[PDB]
Amino acid sequence: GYDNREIVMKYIHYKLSQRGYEWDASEVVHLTLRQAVDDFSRRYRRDFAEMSSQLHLTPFTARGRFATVVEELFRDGVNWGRIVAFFEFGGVMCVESVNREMSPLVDNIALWMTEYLNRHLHTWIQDNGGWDAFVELYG
């Protein structure tokens, strides 16, 4: 297995530097994932900007917002596209957190992403060849 916590941390750190923010916290996998999420981001750019504006992120709504969106995303199953959208969505929440002067939310979202990966996505990811199979498919 690849360490999903490390995959979350590297991706979130990457996304925040894309916005000019600097967040203190296998390389082929990290690069392939960031490329797929970037592609997805650019493909649906206007949609994600509109989502951002409706997020209404506060410390009291963030946890439930993350959980409800992610449970809907995977409601009837998992595939690699939904895994990419999951990283995109978590990244959008982290960006909104720093943009709204709630940068401590970033650390919480990263943990919620890591926890969802390990609690709900690990079996599917492993059953389907692990992150190496993602690299082979998106490469």
């Binding site: 649906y44 917002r65 595939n79 596209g81 969505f89």
Partner: peptide, 21 residues
Amino acid sequence: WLAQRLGRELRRLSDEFVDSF
């Protein structure tokens, strides 16, 4: 409510995106 709409749209886009691999 807002979250259920976000999730459905995300799901729509994911399944489109996965097909483009």
